[PDB]
């Protein structure tokens, strides 16, 4: 998908310590723009991107009401699920919910999704057609029949194919300078001798957006995947991302190795080499 | 923009 809007909900029961934790975040592609934290002081949906701050009072009252409705629904879900699995309210349990939509290059609906997990495991999920459910076990079959009787899928579909896409389009325009930008990776290479015979070549990619990127090492033009160390793409803390890849090369054979960077901001892939000196 | 509709598990 070209662009996406996603909402993430986490609910964590706290035995002996009061109300359950509830944390909700909304993303436009790889950019968080709203948050809600049950332990936060404001008890309102808060902005985390500059373009959503231009929204007026009714927007924020509406989002606050919707996220509090999700918060209170999750509070009931924790008890219901414990009832399904016969659990004695003495342990901490986790509920996670994720829904949203993707749009194509023409900003029109491509796919929608609604996922629900209990204790880090799939519980019930809306199928790609947005019409039926995939239930993971016998407890999810109870949820499925209830949601089928209440026509939950038909009403989630209207949001996922409709409202979700419409407000994604609005966000992409109002926040075009953040959301529609491409920051090509700033790339450099470092050299770290591990002995008199071997050395590590580390290929860097920094300050890039979006997070999707590919780093591959080649030797004589052949892929060296089974010998490349890759850290997962990590956030820099300022809206950009980082990544590096390293290979251990024999001292004297560094010129045989090349690092290739692929990114949306690069029209053609970049080739990096290590120049002794 | 969140969904105004939500149903219990």
């Amino acid at each position: 998908g070209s662009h996406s809007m996603r909402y993430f909900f986490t609910s964590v029961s706290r035995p002996g310590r009061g109300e359950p934790r509830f944390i909700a975040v909304g993303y436009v592609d790889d950019t968080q723009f709203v948050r809600f934290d049950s332990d936060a002081a404001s008890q309102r949906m808060e902005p985390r991107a500059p373009w959503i701050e231009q929204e007026g009072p009714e927007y924020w009252d509406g989002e606050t009401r919707k996220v509090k409705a999700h918060s209170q629904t999750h509070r009931v879900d924790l008890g219901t699920l414990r009832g399904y699995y016969n659990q004695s309210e003495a342990g901490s349990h986790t509920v996670q919910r994720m829904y949203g939509c993707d749009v194509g290059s023409d900003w029109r609906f491509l796919r929608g999704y609604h996922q629900y997990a209990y204790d880090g495991k799939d519980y019930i999920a809306l199928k790609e057609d947005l019409r039926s459910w995939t239930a993971a076990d016998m407890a999810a079959q109870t949820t499925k029949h209830k949601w089928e009787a209440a026509h939950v899928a038909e009403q989630l579909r209207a949001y996922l194919e409709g409202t979700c896409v419409e407000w994604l389009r609005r966000y992409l325009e109002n926040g075009k300078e953040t959301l529609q930008r491409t920051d090509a990776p700033k790339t450099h290479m470092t050299h770290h001798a591990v002995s008199d015979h071997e050395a590590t070549l580390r290929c860097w990619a920094l300050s890039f957006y979006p997070a999707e990127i590919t780093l591959t090492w080649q030797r004589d033009g052949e892929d060296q995947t089974q010998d490349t160390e890759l850290v997962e793409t990590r956030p820099a803390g300022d809206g950009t991302f980082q990544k590096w890849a390293a290979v251990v090369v024999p001292s004297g054979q560094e010129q045989r190795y090349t690092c290739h960077v692929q990114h949306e901001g690069l029209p053609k892939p970049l080739t990096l080499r290590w120049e002794p000196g | 923009f969140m969904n105004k509709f939500i149903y219990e598990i």
């Epitope: 009714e58 509406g62 919707k66 409705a69 009931v76 009403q155 209207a158 409202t163 | 105004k4 509709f5």
Partner: antibody
């Protein structure tokens, strides 16, 4: 400030058709359904049904299912309540109301209909 | 009907009265979404208290709301003749629906 403005009172006879309307003045973010409520003389508030203005998805109360039809015109923000054939039991006050996320926050002024034979 | 209110309550002017609203664990005891509406004869319901104890700025601060378990309460302090009306409670149920109480006729003995 948004207000629901319903259509005038109706004086009807059994067997006739009827359609009462409810136009929401001003604009609101799509966070709400439009709900129709019946209040018979001296009675409580009976939830008849509701409709989503975005996709016209309609939920009815099982007691009113099939006897009345709720529709919407999102281009004019007008909700409709239609009886195919009035039965003289339908003599009551009818309110439209806005259900905003987790709350009925505004009410229409009411449309009294009187079905006498 | 789905929620249970007393059919009638009375009070003297200047005094305080309380109207109860009893539901189940799925509406009143399950959520903090209890609403209260005032209805004068011939007129539409008007929102007085929402979200258990919240109140619109235009509604007099003589009205307050509270909840405990499966029962919510509306309290009106310093009763005035204008407070004599019908009062209805409502609660959130799942599916973003609402259930109402039966209504309570308040009489202010003037």
């Amino acid at each position: 400030e948004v207000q629901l403005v319903q259509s005038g009172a109706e004086v009807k006879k059994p067997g006739e058709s009827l359609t009462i309307s409810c136009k929401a003045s001003g604009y609101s973010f799509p966070n709400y359904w439009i709900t129709w409520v019946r209040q018979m003389s001296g009675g409580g508030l009976e939830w008849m049904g509701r409709i989503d203005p975005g996709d016209s998805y309609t939920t009815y109360n099982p007691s009113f299912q099939g006897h009345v039809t709720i529709s919407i015109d999102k281009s004019t923000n007008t909700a409709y309540l239609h009886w195919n054939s009035l039965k003289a039991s339908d003599t009551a006050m009818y309110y439209c109301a806005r259900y905003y996320v987790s709350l009925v926050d505004i009410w229409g002024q009411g449309t009294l209909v009187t079905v006498s034979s | 009907s789905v929620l249970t209110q007393p059919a009638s309550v009375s009070g003297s002017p200047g005094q305080s009265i309380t109207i109860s609203c009893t539901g189940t664990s799925s509406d009143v005891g399950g959520y903090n979404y209890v609403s209260w509406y005032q209805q004068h004869p011939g007129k539409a319901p008007k929102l007085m208290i929402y979200d258990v104890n919240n109140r619109p700025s235009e509604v007099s601060n003589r009205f307050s709301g509270s909840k405990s378990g499966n029962t919510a309460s509306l309290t009106i302090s310093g009763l005035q003749a204008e407070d004599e009306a019908d009062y209805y409670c409502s609660s959130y149920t799942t599916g973003s629906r609402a259930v109402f109480g039966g209504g309570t006729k308040l009489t202010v003995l003037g």
